[PDB]
Every structure is written in C-alpha cells, then in structure tokens.
Ligand binder design. Sequence first.
Ligand code: BCL
Ligand code: BCL
Ligand code: BCL
Ligand code: BCL
Ligand SMILES: CC[C@H]1c2cc3[nH]c4c(c3C)C(=O)[C@H](C(=O)OC)c4c3nc(cc4[nH]c(cc(n2)[C@@H]1C)c(C(C)=O)c4C)[C@@H](C)[C@@H]3CCC(=O)OC/C=C(\C)CCC[C@H](C)CCC[C@H](C)CCCC(C)C
Ligand SMILES: CC[C@H]1c2cc3[nH]c4c(c3C)C(=O)[C@H](C(=O)OC)c4c3nc(cc4[nH]c(cc(n2)[C@@H]1C)c(C(C)=O)c4C)[C@@H](C)[C@@H]3CCC(=O)OC/C=C(\C)CCC[C@H](C)CCC[C@H](C)CCCC(C)C
Ligand SMILES: COC(C)(C)C/C=C/C(C)=C/C=C/C(C)=C/C=C/C(C)=C\C=C\C=C(C)\C=C\C=C(/C)CC/C=C(\C)CCC=C(C)C
Ligand SMILES: [Fe+3]
Lengths: 240, 302, 281
Amino acid sequence: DLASLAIYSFWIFLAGLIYYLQTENMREGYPLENEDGTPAANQGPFPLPKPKTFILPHGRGTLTVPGPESEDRPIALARTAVSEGFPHAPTGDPMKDGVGPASWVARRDLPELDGHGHNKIKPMKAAAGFHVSAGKNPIGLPVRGCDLEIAGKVVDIWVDIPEQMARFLEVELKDGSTRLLPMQMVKVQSNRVHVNALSSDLFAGIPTIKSPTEVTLLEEDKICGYVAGGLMYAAPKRKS
Amino acid sequence: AEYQNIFSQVQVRGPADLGMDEDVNLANRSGVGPFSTLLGWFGNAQLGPIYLGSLGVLSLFSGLMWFFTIGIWFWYQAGWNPAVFLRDLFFFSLEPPAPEYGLSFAAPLKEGGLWLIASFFMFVAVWSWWGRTYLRAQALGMGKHTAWAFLSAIWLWMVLGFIRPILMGSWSEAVPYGIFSHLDWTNNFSLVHGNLFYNPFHGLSIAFLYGSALLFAMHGATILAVSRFGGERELEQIADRGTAAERAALFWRWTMGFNATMEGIHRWAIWMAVLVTLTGGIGILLSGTVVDNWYVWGQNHG
Amino acid sequence: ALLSFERKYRVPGGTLVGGNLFDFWVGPFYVGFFGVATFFFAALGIILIAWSAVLQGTWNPQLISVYPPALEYGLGGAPLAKGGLWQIITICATGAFVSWALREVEICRKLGIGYHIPFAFAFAILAYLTLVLFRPVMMGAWGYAFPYGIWTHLDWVSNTGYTYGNFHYNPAHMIAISFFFTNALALALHGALVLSAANPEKGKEMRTPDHEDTFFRDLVGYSIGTLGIHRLGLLLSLSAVFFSALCMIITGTIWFDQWVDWWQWWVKLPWWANIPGGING
Ligand code: BCL
Ligand code: BCL
Ligand code: BCL
Ligand code: BCL
Ligand SMILES: CC[C@H]1c2cc3[nH]c4c(c3C)C(=O)[C@H](C(=O)OC)c4c3nc(cc4[nH]c(cc(n2)[C@@H]1C)c(C(C)=O)c4C)[C@@H](C)[C@@H]3CCC(=O)OC/C=C(\C)CCC[C@H](C)CCC[C@H](C)CCCC(C)C
Ligand SMILES: CC[C@H]1c2cc3[nH]c4c(c3C)C(=O)[C@H](C(=O)OC)c4c3nc(cc4[nH]c(cc(n2)[C@@H]1C)c(C(C)=O)c4C)[C@@H](C)[C@@H]3CCC(=O)OC/C=C(\C)CCC[C@H](C)CCC[C@H](C)CCCC(C)C
Ligand SMILES: COC(C)(C)C/C=C/C(C)=C/C=C/C(C)=C/C=C/C(C)=C\C=C\C=C(C)\C=C\C=C(/C)CC/C=C(\C)CCC=C(C)C
Ligand SMILES: [Fe+3]
C-alpha cells in the first residue's frame, strides 16, 4: 500500500542523503594519514568527493577542495611511544613553536576584505565614525596578567567595520611597542582589563604584525593561537 | 572567571550601513532605522533599512487583511465588549464551513464563509512572501537556499489547510483560526486516526525536531568555543581554513570519531531542519486519505 | 587514522584525572580516565538490559522493555525482576552521561577551546534526570519514571500526558514548544544563509557576510549577525529543553488537576469575571 511504499522510499532516500552529506564533509582533512604523514591504509567506506571550485571575490583567485593538503610549516614534535595513539611531545617551547593549544595555521598573509574590497578590521583611530557606544571603554585602561602583574595599556580598539564589532585590543608594552589581544580572551573590568591566558612576562612573546594599520589572516591565527595556548602553558605562573 | 561571549563587553558603533547593491533596485529600500543598544548586547544594533517593493507590499497588505478578518469575527463573539474580548481571547475562533458545504464557497459568512475569506488572504500573503525571499536572493546574486528551505515549511502548511481538505472532500477538515481552538484540532486529529505515535512519519518528524535542537545546540556552542580564533567568520574559514576550523573539527573527531567541515555542517544543518516539515507533511497527507487508523496500519502495514 | 592537520594538536596534557595514564587515543577517539569510565557504565548497562531481556522472554528490540518499580515500592529499592534492574540501569545511564560530559571537558583543555559544548549537553542530562529522578523522588515513587523501551516509552508519554487531559494546556509546555519550533526555523535559515553565500548563482563569486546582512535587512528589516545567530541558536535550544524540564517538574507536584482548568484564574478575574457574553458566560 501507499504509506508502506512512501516509507521505504524515504529510508532509501535518507541513506543517499547521508552518503552525500558525509562525502561533502570530506573536502578538508582527507585523505587520512599515519602519524608519520604517509597515506593511511584504510580510509573508510565513503570515497572522496569530486573537486569543487570557489571563486574568491576581489581578484583573490580560486580555491579547489578537496586538494593537496600541506601544513606548510615545521612541527616541533617528537613521538613518545613506539606505537600509534600516543601524545607527541613539544621538542621546544610549545608557545614559541606553535604546537598543541597554541597551534596556528598557515593561512594567506593578506587581510580579510569586506564586501567592497576594503580591510574588514581597522584600528578604531582609522575608522571614521566609529566610537564606543555602550559598556565601559577599554582604551586607556592598564592590562593585568594571570600573575596579577601589569603588563601594558590599551591604546586602541581594533574594530570590524561591516559587523560593527570590537575584535582586538591594541596593547602598549613596557618598551612602547604594541601587541594585539583577542577581544574574546579578555575581561574588561571597571578599572582594568584582566587577561587570564597569559602571565605578564608572556605579552612581549605575542606575535607582532608588519603593518600598524592592518592584520593579515595568518597573523590573526598566530596571535590567537599563542594567546589560547597560554591557558595550558602559562598555568605555572597563573594564580588565584 | 573567563569571558564566555554570550553578550558583548563593549559596543562599538559606526555610520549606518546601507548595504551591498548588486542588482538590487535601491529605489525600493527604505531609510535606516534607529539603533537598539539592547539588541547590541546580543547581536547587531542597526535596524533597517528594509526593502519593500511591489510583492513586498502585496504580502504585507494581504497579510494584515487575514489578521483583521479573524479579529473582526473575534469582536463579534466578544459582543464588541472589550473586557470580554480580552477575557476570552484564547477562546474565540473562526471555524471553517460545516461538512455540508463540502468544497464549495457557497457557505454563508457566519458559517465558514468568513473563514474562507481569511484563508484566501493568508494564501496570498504567504506565496507572495515566498517569491519575495526568492527574488531578494537573485538581486544579491546568492543561491536560492532560503527559498527552497522555506518551501519545506510551506509544504506542511499547504497540506494542513488545503491539500488534505480537498482530497478529503471538504474545507471542514482544515484547521480553525484560534489559540486554544487549534490546539484541540491537533489533539483530536490524533485520536481520530488511531493515535499518531503509530504514524511512522510523525515519529520521523519528531526525530528531526529533536535533532534540530541537538545540532544547533552543538553547532552554536562549537562556534562560540572557537570564537577566540575568530570562528564565527564562517565564509572566510571556508575559503581559507584556520585553527578555528581545525580545533572545531578535532573536538568532535575525538569525541565521536566522526566530524564535519566548516561548510558541510551547514548542509547538515539545513537538511536536519528542513526534514521536520518534509516528513510531517507526508505523515499528515496520508492520514484520512490512505491510512484511516495508524494503530491498525501498524498491525498489518497493508 | 589521522587528519592531514591533526598531529600538531595531539600534545600531552589537559586531563582532569590520572595524569597521563589514559592520555592517548584509539583510532580517532580520545580516551582519558572518563573514556574508560563511560565504557564501563555502558558495557555493564547493556549487559543488564540483555539480562532483563531473558527474564521477559524476548530478544526483540520492538518489545524489550525495562519497567521501573511499582508505586508500591515507593522510593525504596525493588527486586531485580520487579523494578530493581531499571534502578541499577538508571544509575549506569546517569554514570555514562556524566562521564561523557566530563570527557569532553578534557578534550576541551587539550584543544584550548571554550567549554560551551559540554555545558549545553549538561542541559540534556538535566532533562533526563528530571524525568527519572527529580520528578519521581518528589512524587515518592520510582514508579512515575518512564520505561526503557522503544514503544513502551511512547505509551508512557501518552498516558502521563492524558492524565491531566490535553497536555497542550500546560503553560510551560506551550513556551517549550515555541522555543523548539523557533529553533528549527532559526537552524533552517542559518544553514540556508551561509550556503547561499558560499554557493552563489553559477559563475558568480563567493558572496560575503556583508551580502548576508544585506539579504536579511532587505527581507525582514533586521540582521542578528554572524556571531549573534550562533548565540541565538545556543540560546533557543537550551531554552527549549529548560522549559521542557520545567513543564514536567511542576506537573504532578504543584499541580495535579486538569491542565485546561488551570486557565480559569485568567477568566475568573473580577473585572470581567461576571460580564455577560463571550465564550465564558
Ligand atoms: C522527550 C520526551 C520523551 C520521549 C518522547 C519521544 C517521542 C514522542 C518520540 C521519541 C522517539 C525516539 N526517542 Mg524518545 N523520549 C524520551 C526520552 C528518550 C531517551 C532518554 C535516554 O531519556 C532516549 C535514548 C530516547 C530515544 C528515542 C529514539 C529511539 C527515537 C527518536 C529518534 C531521534 O531522532 O532522537 C533525537 C536524537 C538524534 C537525532 C540523535 C541520534 C540518537 C539515536 C537515534 C539514539 C538511538 C538510541 C537507541 C534506540 C537506544 C540505544 C540504547 C542501547 C543500550 C545503546 N528517548 C522522553 C521520555 N521519543 C521517536 C520515535 O520514533 O519513537 C518510536 C518519537 O516519535
Ligand atoms: C495530542 C496530539 C498528538 C500530536 C498530533 C500532531 C498533529 C495532528 C501534527 C503534529 C505534528 C508534529 N508533532 Mg505532534 N502530536 C503529539 C505529540 C508530539 C510529541 C510528544 C513528545 O508527545 C512531539 C515531539 C511531537 C512533535 C511534532 C512535530 C515533529 C510536528 C510539527 C513540526 C513543526 O515544526 O510544525 C510547525 C510548522 C508549521 C505549521 C509550518 C507551516 C508554517 C507556515 C508556513 C507559516 C505561517 C506563518 C504565519 C502566517 C505567520 C506570519 C508572520 C507574523 C509575524 C506572525 N508531537 C500528540 C500525540 N502532531 C504536525 C506534523 O507534521 O505531523 C506529522 C501535525 O500536523
Ligand atoms: C504542528 C501541529 C499543530 C500546532 C500545534 C501547536 C502546539 C502544540 C502549540 C502551538 C503553539 C503555537 N502555534 Mg501552532 N500548530 C499548528 C499550526 C499553526 C499555524 C499555521 C499552521 O499555518 C500557526 C501560525 C501556528 C501558530 C502557533 C503560535 C501561535 C503558537 C507558537 C509560538 C511559536 O513557536 O511560534 C514560532 C513562530 C515565530 C517565533 C514567529 C511568529 C510569531 C507568533 C505568531 C506569535 C504568537 C503569539 C501569541 C498569540 C501571543 C501570546 C501572548 C499573549 C500576551 C498571551 N500554529 C499545527 C496545526 N501550536 C504553542 C502555544 O503556546 O499555543 C497556545 C503550543 O504549545
Ligand atoms: C499525548 C501526550 C501530550 C504530551 C505529553 C508530553 C509529556 C508527558 C512530556 C512531553 C515532553 C515534551 N513535549 Mg509533549 N505532549 C503532547 C504534544 C506535543 C506537541 C504537539 C505539536 O502536539 C509538541 C511540539 C510537544 C513537545 C514536547 C517537547 C517540548 C518536550 C520533549 C522534549 C524534551 O524534553 O527533550 C529533553 C531531552 C531529553 C529528555 C533527552 C535526554 C538525552 C540524554 C541526556 C542522552 C541520551 C543518550 C543516548 C542514550 C545515547 C545513545 C548513543 C548511541 C551511540 C546512539 N508535545 C501531547 C498533548 N510531552 C516531555 C518533557 O517536557 O520532558 C522534560 C515530557 O515529559
Ligand atoms: C523547517 C521548517 C521550519 C521553518 C522554516 C522557515 N520559515 C520561514 C523561512 C523558513 C526556511 C523563511 O524564509 C520565512 C522568513 O521570512 O523567515 C525570516 C519563514 C517564515 N516562517 C514564519 C512563521 C513560522 N514558521 C514556523 C515554522 C517553521 N519554519 C519550521 C520549524 C512557524 C510555526 C512553528 O508555527 C511559524 C509561525 C513566518 C514569520 C515567516 C514568513 C512570513 C510570511 O509569510 O509573511 C506574510 C506576511 C504577513 C502574514 C504579515 C502580517 C503579520 C501579522 C498577522 C500582523 C502583525 C505583523 C505586521 C508586520 C505588523 C505591521 C504593522 C504596520 C504598522 C507596519
Ligand atoms: C539539551 C539541549 C539539546 C542537546 C544537546 C546535546 N546533546 C549532546 C551534546 C549536546 C550539546 C553532546 O555533546 C553529545 C554528543 O556527543 O553529540 C554528538 C550529545 C548527545 N545527545 C545524544 C542523544 C540525545 N540528545 C537529545 C537532545 C538534546 N541534546 C537537546 C535537544 C535526545 C532526545 C531529544 O531524545 C537524544 C536521544 C547522544 C547521541 C549524545 C551523547 C552520547 C553519550 O553520552 O554517550 C555515552 C553514553 C552511552 C553510549 C550510554 C548508554 C547508557 C546506558 C547504560 C544504556 C541505555 C540506557 C537508556 C536509558 C536506554 C533508553 C532507551 C530508549 C528506547 C528509551
Ligand atoms: C485589536 O484587534 C485588531 C483589530 C487589531 C485585530 C485583532 C486580530 C486578532 C486578535 C487576530 C488573532 C488571530 C490568531 C490568534 C490566528 C491564529 C491561527 C492559527 C493558530 C493557526 C492557523 C492554522 C491554519 C493553517 C493550517 C492554514 C492554512 C491555509 C491554507 C493552506 C490556505 C487555504 C486556502 C483556501 C481556503 C483557498 C482560497 C481560495 C482560492 C480560489 C485559491
Ligand atoms: Fe554557522
């Protein structure tokens, strides 16, 4: 009968749908590999999908996934066991080397452009018309670390023009230089900006940006990566 | 404690954004409205501009006509007495015509005629609004995803007060216009077909209704968790993968040994949700037309 | 067994218990102390259900079912064949659920990300504990809990519901349903929006978030924004489940009569309480 037909059709359909949805989700990261980075023997039931091509706007070129996967950077790690499945330890300074909770990806070294081809993120001083409309203004406040030590001062808010959102805080360090801090990794308080992920002596360690009026995708990744890893790696100095 | 990013710590404002132009006819956009600082704590603060245009106006008017038609009737019932109106607000109701009139427009006002008018207005309001979402996409050169997904929700709506009613032989089968009133119809519909829990599509529907709450809960939380690497910037993380997309993937890979990509999860998302009304539409369409008692059908399947 | 970009993330550390004893993977699965903890509770729990299966006389998923103690046993224990199994199994389930959450917390510390995920989950675990633990304990009997059976459990919903008439009148049930419906509307849109931008009309260039905001402004006049919609999604969901647990914790405890009756307070309000006409008098 109908209902009984309608229902089997559905199950058959739903299986192809899953199939499709599964392979679509294999455009990045595949094929799999062994810990040494050679192609892994078993790749699973689902095959790789055929390539698709994105037309990045603003003359930025194209992108085709799936495609050749490469870290395009060195990985300071060494095996801790003679078999698969175990942690790989940092052969140097995880923070400095960018491994583990402080990893970063080698993204394009350009900034993200908005709909019109303009830089998406700009320091507020260069953002005509932009101003703090609500909440406490961080510009001017001192910056404390997980060790309750002052490390610098906020001298500006870098903002997202199209989304109109505060994204980074520019912080001036002892040697008059600045660094960028993720808006998401800081606690703006009445008379101070508290940063838990890092101890005062780690701020100078934050990666720096070539130009002082823009951040490139690659730079944001190293900056955020570094700050996030402080959660695990700063821990010795972090108190309270 | 660490910051969570549910609400913003600082709001930053700039000149009102008029928005991309593409082929959009700028003549039909309105002026930018104010700025809610309230909304600003959660999401954007800018209001407007809104694009009106021909079809937009058709809908809006058509739509108020539906809402007004119903409300007039309610005032009938309320005896024009305001206090009554307010008191029995959840109780009033505009039921469709009686079984007698079947599929005819013959029935008098006070007997489904008025229901008929309202429905007609609502029918225009929706379909025009559907075309509007298709068109607004074309102007900006984007895919028609929103239009199709919306069709899914329309499918159920269509089956409920139009298709089934016809196939059954009367507008009598349709849903009345009332708060408590339409709840009953639902409870009743179930009882008369042998308790819907036995309807396989109803149960499938529910699987997706829950999965939507499951997946969006998962997805939202995921993104917020990796927003310290600027993950909410999904489109760019598609064209150029960053740690936000890698940690996000690895979290679930290590948790259920299975995972998705920054673009793929939205395919999961759009299908999970869309399947709720898709399956429900079928379930309801087969009730009273092909299957008369789901308990019985469940017994044989034939 | 490894994704092209995964090795750099598999560093030691982040575990909550037992140092690096269980700090390792099995294929793609992270383990840890809680990985083991859940395997245990689950393995054991499945066994108990299988056992409960022989006592019933069936090995059919469509019929197997583990019923709780009868209202006679109140809140005390019961014999295995008469509600005891369900009790032990429930502990194992709760045990598996807390472990999975806590295991995610570890996966979180290793990747240096937020704890939003395990936190949202804790909301589901709470809904479950409302039905099998808090509500029953407040009604003095494991017997009010639901049974672990595919259809037998749908029976429990149907009865429990109809015990108060059309459950549709539970006010918290209404709010709850609202959030659920909204959530799906929201998920539909969010998914369709990102896709229509990442996948524009043939040949055209990939749209941008600007186009996304533009689109909705044009359409409905407002745009929550890329970060907002994700805050919205998390919030709609968790809210939906919160109100679900609430509509149930109050049902059978502070209100045991017909839910439809509850609405009389509104209608009985003095001002209009006796006015003639309308649907009420
Ligand atoms: C919330 C109110 C009621 C309730 C009301 C309903 C109603 C009404 C319906 C269901 C339906 C289902 N319910 Mg229920 N259900 C409840 C509580 C539970 C609990 C629990 C641990 O408390 C569980 C595991 C389930 C599980 C299930 C599924 C078997 C089935 C839905 C598929 C789905 O998409 O789910 C959402 C989850 C996902 C999409 C993720 C994937 C999860 C999979 C499907 C889980 C399978 C579990 C398996 C059957 C049990 C395995 C145990 C073994 C020991 C491993 N329910 C409570 C008590 N449930 C539907 C059905 O078809 O029933 C016959 C249905 O119509
Ligand atoms: C006592 C009654 C029965 C019962 C009877 C029914 C009946 C009858 C139906 C459902 C349906 C559904 N039921 Mg049930 N159901 C029961 C118990 C349950 C339980 C439970 C835990 O006990 C659950 C989880 C569900 C779950 C569900 C959903 C999966 C499904 C509806 C999806 C939806 O999004 O619709 C909402 C979505 C729409 C209505 C889409 C259309 C919307 C249109 C396009 C928009 C109009 C907008 C308006 C004009 C606004 C203009 C704008 C202004 C600003 C306002 N039911 C009991 C046992 N259920 C429906 C279904 O699909 O079933 C197969 C259905 O018909
Ligand atoms: C799917 C199965 C049943 C069904 C079962 C149920 C059940 C069960 C419940 C509802 C509830 C609702 N249903 Mg219904 N409902 C059906 C079909 C419809 C049709 C149309 C089909 O085409 C519509 C528009 C509605 C609309 C509504 C809403 C009025 C209300 C849910 C809020 C929500 O989540 O909105 C999603 C939509 C938006 C967020 C946008 C639009 C805004 C809406 C229109 C606002 C309604 C406000 C309300 C009238 C105001 C109360 C405030 C007063 C101060 C007291 N139903 C079908 C036939 N419906 C709930 C309720 O509370 O009922 C009393 C409820 O528990
Ligand atoms: C005839 C019956 C009554 C009725 C009686 C009830 C009753 C009784 C209850 C509900 C509940 C609910 N009802 Mg009802 N309901 C009716 C009609 C409706 C209609 C409609 C359109 O008519 C709708 C939309 C709803 C909607 C809803 C939901 C809001 C809510 C269930 C979701 C929930 O709690 O999830 C919460 C999620 C969970 C409980 C799941 C927990 C999952 C756990 C943590 C993990 C499990 C993992 C699993 C074992 C793993 C498997 C692993 C394998 C590897 C796969 N009802 C009718 C009128 N409804 C329930 C509620 O509010 O519950 C609190 C409830 O008890
Ligand atoms: C997977 C299916 C899910 C889904 C999807 C979905 N809904 C959608 C879409 C999609 C993909 C849209 O694109 C469309 C949309 O536009 O979204 C923003 C929409 C939409 N889903 C809506 C509702 C809706 N969806 C629901 C459900 C669902 N939608 C499912 C969960 C429900 C439920 C649960 O019942 C409802 C009520 C609409 C809000 C919207 C389509 C709007 C529409 O058709 O409008 C016609 C216009 C009117 C009726 C205008 C008058 C309205 C009121 C009667 C009067 C008060 C308001 C008026 C604006 C006041 C004017 C005052 C004047 C002074 C100016
Ligand atoms: C609270 C908000 C929403 C939500 C969120 C949510 N769910 C989550 C998460 C989140 C954030 C996860 O991280 C976690 C996950 O990893 O998902 C992929 C999960 C998850 N949500 C799941 C299910 C689920 N979520 C549901 C709902 C929801 N989840 C809400 C809508 C439902 C419904 C609607 O019923 C179900 C079935 C799981 C698939 C998964 C968690 C997996 C887990 O904890 O695994 C380890 C445990 C086992 C293998 C346990 C077996 C334990 C017992 C000993 C045996 C069986 C006993 C049980 C009582 C039998 C029931 C039989 C039924 C027939 C009644
Ligand atoms: C202060 O008071 C004022 C004046 C402002 C107005 C007050 C109004 C009020 C208070 C209105 C309240 C209305 C409410 C609460 C309405 C609720 C409706 C609900 C809950 C559900 C609706 C279900 C309806 C669906 C299933 C309807 C589907 C209809 C169709 C698919 C179309 C039907 C099509 C027909 C009859 C054909 C038309 C004719 C042709 C030739 C195609
Ligand atoms: Fe998203």
